[PDB]
Design a protein around this ligand. Sequence first.
Ligand SMILES: OC[C@H]1O[C@@H](S[C@H]2[C@H](O)[C@@H](O)[C@H](O)O[C@@H]2CO)[C@H](O)[C@@H](O)[C@@H]1O
Ligand SMILES: *[C@@H]1O[C@H](CO)[C@@H](O)[C@H](O)[C@H]1NC(C)=O
Length: 602
Amino acid sequence: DYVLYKDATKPVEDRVADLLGRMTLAEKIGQMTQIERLVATPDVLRDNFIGSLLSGGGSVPRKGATAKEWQDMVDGFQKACMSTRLGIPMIYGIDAVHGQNNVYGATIFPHNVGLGATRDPYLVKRIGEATALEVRATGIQYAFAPCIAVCRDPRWGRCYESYSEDRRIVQSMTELIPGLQGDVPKDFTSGMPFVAGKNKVAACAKHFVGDGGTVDGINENNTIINREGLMNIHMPAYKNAMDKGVSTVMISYSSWNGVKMHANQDLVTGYLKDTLKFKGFVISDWEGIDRITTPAGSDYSYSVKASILAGLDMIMVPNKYQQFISILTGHVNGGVIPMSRIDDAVTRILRVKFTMGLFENPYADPAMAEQLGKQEHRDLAREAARKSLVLLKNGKTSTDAPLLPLPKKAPKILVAGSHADNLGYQCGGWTIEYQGDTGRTTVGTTILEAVKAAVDPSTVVVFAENPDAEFVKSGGFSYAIVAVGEHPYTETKGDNLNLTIPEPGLSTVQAVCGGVRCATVLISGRPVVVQPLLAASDALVAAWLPGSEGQGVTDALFGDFGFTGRLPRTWFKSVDQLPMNVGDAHYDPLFRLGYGLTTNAT
Ligand SMILES: OC[C@H]1O[C@@H](S[C@H]2[C@H](O)[C@@H](O)[C@H](O)O[C@@H]2CO)[C@H](O)[C@@H](O)[C@@H]1O
Ligand SMILES: *[C@@H]1O[C@H](CO)[C@@H](O)[C@H](O)[C@H]1NC(C)=O
């Protein structure tokens, strides 16, 4: 009664081949199908031999769910999968792209653009490490991260998910990968997948390729650039990912010179697989195959043929699994898609599952639950937040006293602005909900809370969200901290041609700073029109989307640490200049990539 694939002491490739040789067409196509937990039931998982599940943004068992509730959900799905004839465990994926961010009480790290400002790849690794633990705390084995897009136009609604417009910074930050997955061994072959074990997670380098180079930063659009620019800008970090053993790669919605990435056999098979020698699995984006056609979904039969022939291994359906499975089955049965293509896709999927130890530990570890939101992880996020801040101005004239760092002791201070006490706003998109949200959406410390935690007990802290000029002038304030900026957004909702922050933002800064010396904290996913905020402010800090740990902000405002962050993107003078990147011809920045003022700790 020995079955070689169930034997944990055998080599991964022997286990993969042994299992593959036993599988029916239905079992094989099943591996290739990922479905939303929203459509999953025990019978659906068993009857369709489903290979993977995901939670999309905001797909949660319930609002407020505990780590254990997540574990019990995942384990209930796994129980169903393990009960099939072959008992192939599912892999569960989720967008843990700045911590385990769909989950209440999870540590929310700064978004990527802020992490780019740190120039600290070891920090990002340690964030990968903490994120894996917080993901495994919820029973989940697979994170759709890192986004290694090189955003070339900040009008893109996902620019905050890019570490930098400079491919070299992005390349340096692929250290997230061995943080999430573990360090590959001495003699590792570039392109092979790797995950250390049950305390780590499979990663996903996304979105292949040129997602950050789209015309006018239009999300999911066309990236018009020759092979040499594709390979010089958008590709390099994928090779770094191969060298670090990234387990999966997700394909972009975007097109390259008019060809849909989800149908690009030359790039997916010819380049990623045959040239970079990637041996993990390639996954679609969410209804990515549907979007091959215009309109989307209008020829699903073609979407399945084109994508699987292009070299995609797993399809994030994620809802219409019966139609996907029926169509791919028919294509195989009719000789349109050879068995060799199915066998390759399934080889890769199983290779990742076996390598990461999923057949040995298919179920959650309840002892890991307490990793969620752990104070050591918050301290890390707080460090990252502080390191991400870029000080853009610290004095209206070169002769003024520097405003920062501020003194912790003063009779009375003002904290103001729409973003001074709003956790959701300081977290941005991909936090609790897909699009993010407003207000106290999870566990954290707002800027106002951090000020109160930082200041001398004699210091009276006044909060006013949008005070008028008279209120400020009459307040007897020593100084003000005013926080304003962008509202949370994701993907196309963030595509923005004007890049001016919503009002009241500017008007609040003008009223505050017109009455008292002010430090303006700008919360944004990207450079936004900033000359008017600058002209009003004594000091101004670009804080990006710093996450749950607002004490990172006050750590630098009050001089516990000096400002060290440096712009990871060009700050434009005007949106009419865009696209404009470091190294262009017409390069006329307000602040060049690399700019950032410093302070010393007090
Ligand atoms: O979340 C998986 C995958 O998604 C796309 S966006 C996805 C949201 O998760 C889902 O809740 C919403 O209704 O649909 C959107 C896309 O239309 C994303 O490009 C990718 O990075 C992410 O890993
Ligand atoms: C780019 O966006 C326009 C709408 O702005 C749309 O008509 C077109 O199909 C898009 N192209 C691609 C390749 O996504």
